[PDB]
Amino acid sequence: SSDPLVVAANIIGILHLILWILDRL
Amino acid sequence: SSDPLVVAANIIGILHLILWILDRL
Amino acid sequence: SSDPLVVAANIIGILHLILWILDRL
Amino acid sequence: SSDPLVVAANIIGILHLILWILDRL
Numbered sequence A, B, C, D: 001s002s003d004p005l006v007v008a009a010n011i012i013g014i015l016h017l018i019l020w021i022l023d024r025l
């Protein structure tokens, strides 16, 4: 299986990066 | 039995995301 | 082996940190 | 033992959060 906390970590990090890039652009 | 390291990572990432959103708003 | 999801977490985090530093400077 | 890839994830996120706060403050 996969750790649900690591998936959550990825989701949070990906969203933060995406929202920040779109904010700047 | 969750990994505290991974829990810490989620707390940091989520706090950072929330603090950044609220600052931009 | 290493968890691919933890590898993705590092890649995302360090990319975000690098892009933000570069943006600011 | 602790997973070093998870330690690094915490170090990156913590550094990034701190740098961003200090930059805003």
Ligand SMILES: [Ca+2]
Residues within 6 Å of the ligand: B022, B023, B024, B025
């Ligand atoms: Ca503000």
Ligand SMILES: [Ca+2]
Residues within 6 Å of the ligand: C022, C023, C024, C025
């Ligand atoms: Ca710039």
Ligand SMILES: [Ca+2]
Residues within 6 Å of the ligand: D022, D023, D024
């Ligand atoms: Ca500044």
